[PDB]
Write a structure and sequence with these properties.
Chain F: Its main location: nucleus. Chain F: It is found in: Nucleus. The complex is a heteroheptamer, with 2 copies of chain A, 2 copies of chain C, 1 copy of chain E and 2 copies of chain F. Chain A has a single domain (1-150), classed as Beta Complex (Beta-clip-like). By secondary structure, chain A is of the alpha+beta class. In chain A, the strands form 4 sheets. A 3-stranded antiparallel sheet of chain A has the order 3-9-8, with helices on one face. Chain A has a 3-stranded antiparallel sheet with strand order 4-6-5. A two-stranded antiparallel sheet of chain A has the order 1-2. Chain A is globular and about 40 Å long. The longest helix of chain A has 11 residues, at 5-15. Chain A has helices spanning 5-15, 54-64; strands at 20-24, 30-34, 43-47, 49-53, 73-75, 80-88, 95-96, 102-109, 112-119, 130-131. By secondary structure, chain E is mostly loops. Chain E is 0% helix and 0% strand. Chain E is elongated, with a radius of gyration of 5 Å. By secondary structure, chain F is mainly β. In chain F, 0% of the residues lie in helices and 46% in strands. Chain F has strands at 5-10, 15-16, 22-24, 30-34, 41-51, 57-63, 79-83, 89-91, 94-96, 107-114, 121-126, 129-136, 144-150, 154-158, 173-174. Chain F is globular, with a radius of gyration of 14 Å. Classes of the chains: A alpha+beta, C little secondary structure, E little secondary structure, F mainly beta. Chain A binds chain D through residues 48-53, 55-56, 59, 82-83, 86-89, 112, 114, and chain D through 1-10, 12, 16-17. Strand 4 (49-53) of chain A pairs parallel with strand 2 of chain D. The complex binds S-adenosyl-L-homocysteine (2 copies) and zinc ion (2 copies). One zinc ion (ZN) binds at residues 97, 136, 138, 140, 143-144 of chain B.
Chain lengths: 150, 148, 17, 19, 6, 178, 176
Amino acid sequence: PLGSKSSQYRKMKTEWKSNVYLARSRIQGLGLYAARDIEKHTMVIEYIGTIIRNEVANRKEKLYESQNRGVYMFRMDNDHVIDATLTGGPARYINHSCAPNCVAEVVTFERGHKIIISSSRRIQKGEELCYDYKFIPCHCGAVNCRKWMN
Amino acid sequence: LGSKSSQYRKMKTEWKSNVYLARSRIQGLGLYAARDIEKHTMVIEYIGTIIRNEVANRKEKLYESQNRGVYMFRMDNDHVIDATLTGGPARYINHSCAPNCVAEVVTFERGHKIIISSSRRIQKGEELCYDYKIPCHCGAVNCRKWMN
Amino acid sequence: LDENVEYEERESEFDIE
Amino acid sequence: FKELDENVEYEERESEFDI
Amino acid sequence: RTKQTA
Amino acid sequence: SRVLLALHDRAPQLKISDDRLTVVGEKGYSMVRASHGVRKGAWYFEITVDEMPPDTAARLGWSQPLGNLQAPLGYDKFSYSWRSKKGTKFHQSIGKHYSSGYGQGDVLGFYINLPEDTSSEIIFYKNGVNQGVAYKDIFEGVYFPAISLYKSCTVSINFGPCFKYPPKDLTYRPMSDM
Amino acid sequence: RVLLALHDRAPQLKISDDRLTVVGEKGYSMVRASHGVRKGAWYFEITVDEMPPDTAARLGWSQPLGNLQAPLGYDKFSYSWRSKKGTKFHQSIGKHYSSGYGQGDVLGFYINLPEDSSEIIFYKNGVNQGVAYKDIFEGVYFPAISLYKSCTVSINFGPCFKYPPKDLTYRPMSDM
Ligand SMILES: Nc1ncnc2c1ncn2[C@@H]1O[C@H](CSCC[C@H](N)C(=O)O)[C@@H](O)[C@H]1O
Ligand SMILES: Nc1ncnc2c1ncn2[C@@H]1O[C@H](CSCC[C@H](N)C(=O)O)[C@@H](O)[C@H]1O
Ligand SMILES: [Zn+2]
Ligand SMILES: [Zn+2]
């Protein structure tokens, strides 16, 4: 059952721009930040990109490597991967942290699966958004950091 | 629909939104459906003072001697509900040879109650009437022509 | 009150004045 | 880089997997 | 490889 | 037998679950009927709207075997339907004001009454609430629980005997009695 | 400023620091808002933050005399909307009304108190669920939350709502 996920999703799609902004990360490179106060259990932004097959993702990764283009892929399911390297949405910029304030979840609609980034606690304005990548040295800078993203 | 107890408790909280008083085509004032009432629904209670028969006989003669309209309903063979002074809107429900309501005594522990329930579906605006020598003016087809 | 009231008879309820 | 309002399905080319 | 949920 | 969505008496473009109690729509209005019909007595079943995105709609209710499967319910004289959009009632493609609309999460109830002789009526329920008599003195014949969907919405049907909002004000038999 | 009352509340209810979030505790118990309305059209929102299994809520409006150690809708002084099955309650009488609501749902609460035709209307995610009660008791009504076991809701008195109604006029509770 979808519960309130449909309403939450549509509502989020109309105002995700008011929730986030792009800025240089204290962790690494660019990151996504809270543009305003965000309450617990709030759908913040959708991870958007091009849906590719597994072997395509394997080819693309080696191609995205050898040009030093980092990881902008999010696994949708066992057969498909969302590639946001060349095209997609700003959610690609959300960094990894050992102390995450967001969570990445799959919502199954009829028209397809959606990767949704939701808050796991109240997030104040100016805070950098971050979740657990669940995959390399880690630099999230949090107290009691796991030192590694693996 | 459920236990008569729970139906009664429900009805007592919303009977006001079931009925309204108006001049009847039958006689004097009457009670009408404020809304739509499905069949077998408790509409309103006939309230009043429960008295024994011989008390009712004395009270009735007393009222008539003071030219005051008597409103009474017989529960069982030994008791009457006198609604002349402590009655409710249900006291104005007229008789019809073609009734859309019925009056039933419901034997409960804290006392008998006279409940007027719908015998059929009743549409808003209809006059409420149940089956109780003066001529009968219920206006129904094949009226029994007589009362009391 | 919108509820039945149970009449309490007197000892002389049925007597003639 | 191009922005997307929604996910799109990748249209693979014939030589997608070739080296 | 890829970011995941599980 | 088991009262389910029909195996063959259905539009091919409709996607029916393996339980045959859940159906997903596909483009223009298309219909699926249940496996059992009724000709006499009062009967009841429920439908739950699992997912109904914007620009998708449903028309639910009863249909005779001759109801066009490549058309919305209530298209011909062989069916009577209740539309999610605006709660309109349809029969012979004529939409009349009936109730307010329903959508995702709503559990709709469907009462039919086909009495013999000693009048027939169709009544819809929304989340337990009686929406009034929709059609009275309907055509005589066998009537089947029917579902028509516009675009990719999803509904699940319950023939009983255990309903989420079992009618109190009316007596009935669950469609699962067939 | 309009908040959850710190004294007009069942003591076992856990109120957040900003007094806009309440967590329930065992049997149904109620908290009212600090401000009430007697006349006019008013509106407020409640978001169900967390509703674990076997937990429930009954939300709506309550007069001052509404029993704090009972579910909303228990007596004549309040009208409520139950999370389970979307039942409406008044004087402990449950009637069918709408579908249920749960975690993540944004509920709207409208009341209209004419000067003389009153009504109470509930909203689910911006959708009018219909008039729940009309011609209610005359009095002062307070936004009211009753919770069964450990579920968590948050109230918003305005002026900015997530789903501001588009089919009728109102004033946010925050104006009081
Ligand atoms: N906690 C962390 N420590 C070190 N590198 C991180 C990190 N979280 C994310 N990254 C880096 O960021 C990439 C994820 S995409 C995240 C946005 C990125 N910082 C950018 O500016 O484009 C990964 O390839 C990883 O190298
Ligand atoms: N069907 C009927 N035809 C003629 N008189 C009737 C009647 N039903 C009720 N009444 C009159 O109404 C009395 C019952 S009390 C019913 C209310 C009454 N119409 C009133 O305004 O007071 C009876 O004594 C009888 O005189
Ligand atoms: Zn770290
Ligand atoms: Zn007569």
